[PDB]
Amino acid sequence: KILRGEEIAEKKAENLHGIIERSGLEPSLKLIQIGDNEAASIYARAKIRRGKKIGIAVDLEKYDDISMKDLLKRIDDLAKDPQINGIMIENPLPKGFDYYEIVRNIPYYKDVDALSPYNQGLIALNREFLVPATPRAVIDIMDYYGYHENTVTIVNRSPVVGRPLSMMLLNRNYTVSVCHSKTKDIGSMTRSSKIVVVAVGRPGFLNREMVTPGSVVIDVGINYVNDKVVGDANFEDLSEYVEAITPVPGGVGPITATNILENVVKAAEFQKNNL
Amino acid sequence: KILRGEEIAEKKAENLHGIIERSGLEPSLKLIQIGDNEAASIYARAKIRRGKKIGIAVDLEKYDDISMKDLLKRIDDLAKDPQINGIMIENPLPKGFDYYEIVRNIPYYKDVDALSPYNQGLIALNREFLVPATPRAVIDIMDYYGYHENTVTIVNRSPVVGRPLSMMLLNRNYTVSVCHSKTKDIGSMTRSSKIVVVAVGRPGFLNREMVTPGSVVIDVGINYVNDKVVGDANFEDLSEYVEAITPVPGGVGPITATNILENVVKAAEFQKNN
Ligand SMILES: NC(=O)c1ccc[n+]([C@@H]2O[C@H](COP(=O)([O-])OP(=O)(O)OC[C@H]3O[C@@H](n4cnc5c(N)ncnc54)[C@H](OP(=O)(O)O)[C@@H]3O)[C@@H](O)[C@H]2O)c1
Numbered sequence: 001k002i003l004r005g006e007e008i009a010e011k012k013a014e015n016l017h018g019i020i021e022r023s024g025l026e027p028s029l030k031l032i033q034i035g036d037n038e039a040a041s042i043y044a045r046a047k048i049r050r051g052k053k054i055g056i057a058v059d060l061e062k063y064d065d066i067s068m069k070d071l072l073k074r075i076d077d078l079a080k081d082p083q084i085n086g087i088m089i090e091n092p093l094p095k096g097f098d099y100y101e102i103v104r105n106i107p108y109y110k111d112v113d114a115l116s117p118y119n120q121g122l123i124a125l126n127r128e129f130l131v132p133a134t135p136r137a138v139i140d141i142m143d144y145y146g147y148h149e150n151t152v153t154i155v156n157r158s159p160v161v162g163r164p165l166s167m168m169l170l171n172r173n174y175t176v177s178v179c180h181s182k183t184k185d186i187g188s189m190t191r192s193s194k195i196v197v198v199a200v201g202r203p204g205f206l207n208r209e210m211v212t213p214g215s216v217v218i219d220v221g222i223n224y225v226n227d228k229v230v231g232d233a234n235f236e237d238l239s240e241y242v243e244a245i246t247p248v249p250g251g252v253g254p255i256t257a258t259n260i261l262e263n264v265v266k267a268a269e270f271q272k273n274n275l
Numbered sequence: 276k277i278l279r280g281e282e283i284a285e286k287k288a289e290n291l292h293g294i295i296e297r298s299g300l301e302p303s304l305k306l307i308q309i310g311d312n313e314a315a316s317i318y319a320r321a322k323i324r325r326g327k328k329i330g331i332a333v334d335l336e337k338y339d340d341i342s343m344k345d346l347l348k349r350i351d352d353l354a355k356d357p358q359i360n361g362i363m364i365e366n367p368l369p370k371g372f373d374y375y376e377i378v379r380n381i382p383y384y385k386d387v388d389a390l391s392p393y394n395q396g397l398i399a400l401n402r403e404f405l406v407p408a409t410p411r412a413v414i415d416i417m418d419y420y421g422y423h424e425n426t427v428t429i430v431n432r433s434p435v436v437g438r439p440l441s442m443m444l445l446n447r448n449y450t451v452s453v454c455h456s457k458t459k460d461i462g463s464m465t466r467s468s469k470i471v472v473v474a475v476g477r478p479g480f481l482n483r484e485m486v487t488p489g490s491v492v493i494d495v496g497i498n499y500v501n502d503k504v505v506g507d508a509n510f511e512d513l514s515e516y517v518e519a520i521t522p523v524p525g526g527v528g529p530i531t532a533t534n535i536l537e538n539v540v541k542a543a544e545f546q547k548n549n
């Protein structure tokens with residue numbers, strides 16, 4: 001009933017430290033950050049720290065201010081470097097810097113964030129190779145707590161969450177509805193599904209009216225309200241009504257970083273095998 | 276009541292022509308067919324023929340017996356050639372020949388079938404460039420007949436239909452449900468959407484119990500019974516009851532070839548600039 005993520009992350013990371021010891025890989029991950037976004041820095045250091053524990057070299061390159069020219073070059077140099085297995089650009093970026101074109105000059109087998117067109121392509125086509133960290137982390141919860149073959153409603157249709165997630169759920173035999181700010185009647189769809197994955201970035205959004213007693217709620221939102229961190233779901237309200245629910249913080253979030261490292265391991269071994 | 280696609284194809288072909296005049300492109304599309312499949316040959320001739328009418332050069336390369344290695348060579352040759360804008364391998368193939376691995380060898384900007392990873396990704400990313408023809412045709416019908424931002428239930432999760440299609444409907448603000456053989460109660464989900472798109476390839480699959488009077492059925496199945504050709508829906512039955520429905524043949528069917536020609540224009544106007 002309380003879908004915790006910390007214990008799932010540790011298992012993944014043990015499994016992964018396994019695979020590197022007795023495989024002899026030495027995966028490398030470059031991180032690039034532009035500005036001082038506090039969320040992104042915390043995300044960077046969590047990946048450096050878990051990398052260190054697992055055996056992954058993860059290095060952060062901060063830049064106060066960089067041109068498109070110099071940044072594109074830097075990525076180009078990193079892309080060509082065979083000792084660099086993964087490359088990841090952190091978000092948000094400054095104005096006029098578009099993630100989806102920048103990210104495209106990273107070869108897909110270095111694309112650890114897995115949001116480049118080629119990687120989304122293979123997910124779409126059910127030949128998952130590198131898969132984004134959050135949709136990954138939602139399925140982890142499902143795998144770990146025992147949810148299979150269900151109807152799922154995703155409230156979110158972004159490239160980072162609900163779109164690759166919808167395609168990953170179909171690759172695994174789930175029945176899938178996606179909806180969004182232009183859906184006239186969300187409540188109807190969310191009450192009818194076994195599972196509700198929610199990522200609208202709006203506190204209090206998923207309340208009792210949106211779910212049934214049989215509901216399993218996976219809260220992807222992260223909101224700051226009163227220096228405090230909270231998801232999209234009225235956690236307290238539902239935890240006494242719904243069948244199972246991810247708390248925020250402590251649900252999807254503890255897994256993300258490790259699922260990035262998971263991608264860096266797959267990438268580094270695909271490089272060994274193929275180049 | 277009757278959702279036909281010949282008006283739509285004809286209109287799209289005229290627009291295509293105008294687009295060719297008004298930029299002076301001479302787009303050319305290469306077809307490769309390996310085998311003697313009947314439907315593929317019809318499809319290829321339809322592309323050639325509509326291509327002739329519209330101002331696109333479409334040329335076809337038949338084979339009886341090709342090796343993987345030569346085909347792969349031929350495709351690299353066609354890809355490196357700047358005077359060939361489109362490349363398409365017809366289906367089906369010799370056994371153990373994986374379509375989806377051949378096609379990643381076609382530059383995404385030559386890939387008019389739009390089934391390659393890069394073009395699937397751009398659809399998913401809401402940055403559509405070349406799009407697959409059957410989902411495009413579904414969206415043609417919905418547009419032409421006034422059906423904007425509705426609930427949709429697609430019964431099909433293949434990469435040729437329901438997957439690109441789910442993504443293309445989301446880019447246009449529809450709300451999307453996707454089901455398949457492992458969905459526990461399909462009727463429950465089809466009856467709750469304004470629009471039901473079926474493409475399961477099973478005659479009589481979509482019957483009266485799984486739709487409503489307000490329902491809009493788009494029937495993508497192509498099935499053969501008594502040499503007669505039929506959809507997945509139960510057409511004679513559903514025509515009286517449902518609000519609108521596509522005939523098989525004659526609904527989505529007539530738009531396909533032209534949608535491939537649409538990508539070929541797009542593919543040509545992209546190549547001029549790059
Ligand atoms: N757990 C993690 O480590 C992690 C990772 C990634 C993201 N997130 C979080 O998840 C949330 C979304 O992430 P994102 O990158 O997907 O953001 P995004 O691009 O802004 O997506 C927001 C989505 O929510 C939908 N939405 C917003 N308000 C709605 C409403 N009132 N009714 C129905 N739909 C509504 C939007 O609909 P439209 O498409 O129509 O605009 C959009 O699809 C944020 O809270 C973000 O911080 C957390």
Ligand SMILES: NC(=O)c1ccc[n+]([C@@H]2O[C@H](COP(=O)([O-])OP(=O)(O)OC[C@H]3O[C@@H](n4cnc5c(N)ncnc54)[C@H](OP(=O)(O)O)[C@@H]3O)[C@@H](O)[C@H]2O)c1
Pocket residue numbers: 409430431432433434435436437454455456457461474475476477494495496497498527528531
């Ligand atoms: N109209 C056109 O111009 C045109 C163009 C392309 C395709 N099509 C037609 O559309 C049909 C499908 O095309 P495709 O290439 O996508 O074929 P496909 O790859 O075999 O897809 C069949 C899909 O239908 C689902 N399905 C089959 N039986 C089902 C059942 N009993 N209950 C629920 N779902 C079921 C399958 O579920 P699973 O995923 O679980 O197997 C699968 O996702 C075929 O008849 C084909 O000829 C027509």
